[PDB]
Amino acid sequence: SKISYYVNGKDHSTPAGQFMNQGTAAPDSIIHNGTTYVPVRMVSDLVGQPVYWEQASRTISLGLPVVKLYNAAGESVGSATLEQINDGVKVKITASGLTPGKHGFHVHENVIQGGDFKSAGGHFNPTDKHHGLENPQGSHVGDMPNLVVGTDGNAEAEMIIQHGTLEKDQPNTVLGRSLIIHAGEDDGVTDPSGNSGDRVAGGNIPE
Amino acid sequence: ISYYVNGKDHSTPAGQFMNQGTAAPDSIIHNGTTYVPVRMVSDLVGQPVYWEQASRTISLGLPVVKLYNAAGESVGSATLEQINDGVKVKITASGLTPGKHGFHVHENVIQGGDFKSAGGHFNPTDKHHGLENPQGSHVGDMPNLVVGTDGNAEAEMIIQHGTLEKDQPNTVLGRSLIIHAGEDDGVTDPSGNSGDRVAGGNIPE
Ligand SMILES: [Cu+2]
Ligand SMILES: [Cu+2]
Ligand SMILES: [Zn+2]
Ligand SMILES: [Zn+2]
């Protein structure tokens, strides 16, 4: 049975009762216990706000993307919000339980699969630059300043992904990638990662 | 599943959405696709949601009424909007005889295209019928729809003192709109002598 959807009086119904997304079809509606359900990737069109979906962690973000950060063991270490600004994305990060000192902090190219930080790949580098904000041949769009962790093991910071975008399908789109916190300090000059070393925490940027 | 709104956690305590006086899972996985309740996400952005069973329509932001004739053909559509003075109705209809047609909010939903089942005019303030009656009027009383030679109505009208707020005396949610065969004379109890019911639709809730 066809369910119809109107938004402020305008028809948003699908033509055949199917929702299409990245070359897959799904029924556009399920009714269960009297409640109407729609696919997660359809519900932006119905609520007039961007809807971000992190499939492996089953996290929906409305408005601002949320990044949940985990250690290698799958335990929560903190979170971050992203917000689009002029020619960048503003990252507001909270983290706890990290070793005091400076930690390398970057957007990596790939999503983390199965909680294995090696799967994140290298730094997000759509402009084909060398690593480092202090490098004359820098920098990766993914490069941020070190996360400064206190004696208490905590960090709170606002970093900018310079030239990053939350818009979909753009060379500098940071949606559907990852944030990685390193064990070591980023020296701001050395390829590929500022001599940042191991990946101690990370999380997926929804899309 | 987890829900965040502009960065704050809005997740449910136990994975259940409270709706319709029952619980539904705050998500459903069907054949590799994650479904979420339209009402939970719309509620999180502050956008109202309404449902109408006969038309199987979800109305987001403002109610849409689908109008049908006795044969069950779609003959038009109305949007309802909350205003200071009541509820604004913007209506389009086709298939009507040229001339003036009575147009009212009736007290009940239409049960399966039986327009009699809509009952009388919505009358929460216990007045007489008619916008020209010194003892009027029903909250459900609107002016006549003027239908051209083409059989088409297009009008903007106010349900005076009506409301889309829930659980108020003058709530029009879950009632009906009826278009009559005849002209509403604006005076005669109980329906202005507007005669038969020729089209109608249920107001979402
Ligand atoms: Cu890195
Ligand atoms: Cu009537
Ligand atoms: Zn880099
Ligand atoms: Zn009346």
Numbering used by the authors:
A (entry chain A): 14 to 220
B (entry chain B): 16 to 220
Quoted passage from the original study:
pmcMost aerobes ranging from prokaryotes to eukaryotes are equipped with Cu/Zn-superoxide dismutase (CuZnSOD), which facilitates the disproportionation of superoxide into hydrogen peroxide and molecular oxygen. In order to become an active enzyme, CuZnSOD primarily needs to bind a copper ion at the copper-binding site because it functions as the active center for the disproportionation of superoxide. A structural significance of the S–S bond in CuZnSOD is to tether a loop to the protein core and thereby shape an entry site of the substrate O2− leading to the catalytic copper ion. Here, we found that a CuZnSOD protein in Paenibacillus lautus (PaSOD) has no Cys residue but exhibits a significant level of enzyme activity.
In contrast, we successfully solved the crystal structures of PaSOD-1 by the single-wavelength anomalous diffraction method using wavelengths of Cu and Zn absorption edges at 1.50 Å and 1.45 Å resolution, respectively. We used the structure from data collected at a wavelength of Zn absorption edge (1.275 Å) to discuss the PaSOD-1 structure unless otherwise noted. Furthermore, PaSOD was found to form a homodimer through the N-terminal domain with a novel protein fold. Furthermore, the α-helices from each of the subunits are held together by a hydrophobic cluster made of valine residues (V100, V102, V105, and V109) and thereby form an intersubunit two-helix bundle (right). PaSOD-1CTD assumes an immunoglobulin-like fold commonly observed for CuZnSOD, which is mainly composed of eight β-strands. PaSOD-1CTD was found to bind a copper and zinc ion, the positions of which were determined based upon the anomalous scattering data collected at wavelengths 1.373 Å (Cu signal) and 1.275 Å (Cu and Zn signals). Their binding sites are almost overlapped with those in hSOD1 and EcSodC; a copper ion in PaSOD-1CTD is ligated through His168, His170, His185, and His244, whereas a zinc ion through His185, His193, His202, and Asp205. His185 is a so-called bridging ligand binding both a copper and zinc ion. Reduction of the S–S bond is known to significantly decrease the conformational stability of both hSOD1 (21) and EcSodC; therefore, we wondered how PaSOD-1 lacking the S–S bond maintains the interaction between loop IV and the β8 strand. When we looked on loop IV–β8 strand interaction from the direction pointed by a red arrow in Figure 6, A and B, the S–S bond in hSOD1 was found to be replaced with a phenyl group of Phe179 and a hydrogen of Gly264 in PaSOD-1. Moreover, Asp52 in loop IV of hSOD1 points outward but is replaced with Ile174 pointing inward in PaSOD-1, where a hydrophobic cluster (Ile174, Gly176, Gly177, Phe179, Gly264, and Gly265) is formed between loop IV and β8 strand. Another notable feature in PaSOD-1 is that the side chain carbonyl and amide groups of Asn266 form hydrogen bonds with the main chain amide and carbonyl group of Ile174, respectively, whereas these hydrogen bonding interactions are missing in hSOD1.
